[PDB]
Design a protein around this ligand. Structure first.
Ligand SMILES: c1ccc(Nc2nc(Nc3ccccc3)n3nccc3n2)cc1
Length: 328
């Protein structure tokens, strides 16, 4: 019977209309107000384009959604409206649809991002602390509003390196947290899927996002994209096991009385825990300081209940200089 250690009662205390996204009655804006300038991104659920608001002539992001259930689209919209205005949360400006096809488009404030594959390698030690801290504000905020992002990964973190601005995007897989609720484990992207999803523990919570963040963080400091490189869901768990060790996994499975699929349990085998320093090399030496390791260690824990909360992560000494600069 797992439950969140923090913000567990957020949706319990708020009006049913706050979290009842299926009751939402979408108020469609004007399709023609926004025009496509250039394609900038794509995914299995949508196509993204840099656009222009014909009225004010300012930039915008046009996320054209691929065919999907009415329920899922109202969910992303409700979540975007509830989070609009929060620290580093992408800002939903409008919602429109194509009359004939009914193809919906979500309009967002613009963010001039820089592909992480090219950006990350140039980030300095301080840049990593700064940006991870900013991403942390976004997670503590959405969690405090009773929402799990469920798809934290580089591609969903827009970074304008010039203006040092950060935005957490694509809430298409986000969901409201309800104590005891059993959620679908088919969320997030494989490399950032936490153990809970890989072993079918359905009653997960905000902590799922912290494992994902931890994967991102580990990839940045160790300069290894992605950190846990698995080919399918089974292999994803195996790559994690060979690092954290199988004792921790077995302890985890016993705590939540979970039985691993015979096949999976066979693939995982048995592995000793590998110290985080064995991943250091001349390419990442200038980033793997002791504070970084202590911090990463507290994020990548099998037991989702053991992981630091977004709020705790922000106070870790690792971010001490980022906080000091902010409070100046
Ligand atoms: C991959 C890339 C972008 C998105 N969506 C996406 N892209 C951007 N900005 C952007 C601009 C230029 C190049 C890349 C991103 N933004 N900016 C705000 C929201 C958003 N969503 C989705 C997947």
């Amino acid at each position: 019977m797992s439950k969140a250690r923090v913000y567990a009662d957020v949706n319990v205390l708020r009006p049913k209309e706050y979290w009842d996204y299926e009751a939402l009655t979408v108020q469609w804006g004007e399709q023609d107000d926004y025009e496509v300038v250039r394609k900038v991104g794509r995914g299995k659920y949508s196509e993204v384009f840099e656009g222009i608001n014909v009225n004010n002539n300012e930039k915008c992001i046009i996320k054209i959604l691929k065919p999907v259930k009415k329920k899922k689209i109202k969910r992303e919209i409700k979540i975007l409206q509830n989070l609009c205005g929060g620290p580093n949360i992408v800002k939903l400006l409008d919602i429109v649809r194509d009359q004939h096809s009914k193809t919906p488009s979500l309009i967002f404030e613009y963010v001039n991002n820089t592909d992480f594959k090219v950006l990350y390698p140039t980030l300095t030690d301080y840049d990593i602390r700064y940006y991870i801290y900013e991403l942390l504000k976004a997670l503590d905020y959405c969690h405090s509003q009773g929402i799990m992002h469920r798809d934290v990964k580089p591609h969903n973190v827009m970074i304008d390196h010039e203006l040092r601005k950060l935005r957490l995007i694509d809430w298409g897989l986000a969901e409201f947290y309800h104590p005891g609720k059993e959620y679908n484990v088919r969320v997030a992207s494989r490399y950032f899927k936490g153990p809970e999803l890989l072993v079918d523990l359905q009653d997960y919570d905000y902590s799922l996002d912290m494992w994902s963040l931890g994967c991102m963080f580990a990839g940045m400091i160790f300069r290894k994209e992605p950190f846990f490189y698995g080919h399918d869901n089974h292999d994803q768990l195996v790559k994690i096991a060979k690092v954290l060790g199988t004792d921790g996994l077995n302890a985890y499975l016993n705590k939540y009385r979970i039985e691993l699929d015979p096949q999976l349990e066979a693939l995982v085998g048995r592995h000793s825990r590998k110290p985080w320093l064995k991943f250091m090399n001349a390419d990442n030496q200038h980033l793997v300081s002791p504070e970084a390791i202590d911090f990463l260690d507290k994020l990548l824990r099998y037991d989702h209940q053991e992981r630091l909360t977004a709020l705790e992560a922000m106070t870790h000494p690792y971010f001490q200089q980022v906080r000091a600069a902010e409070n100046s």
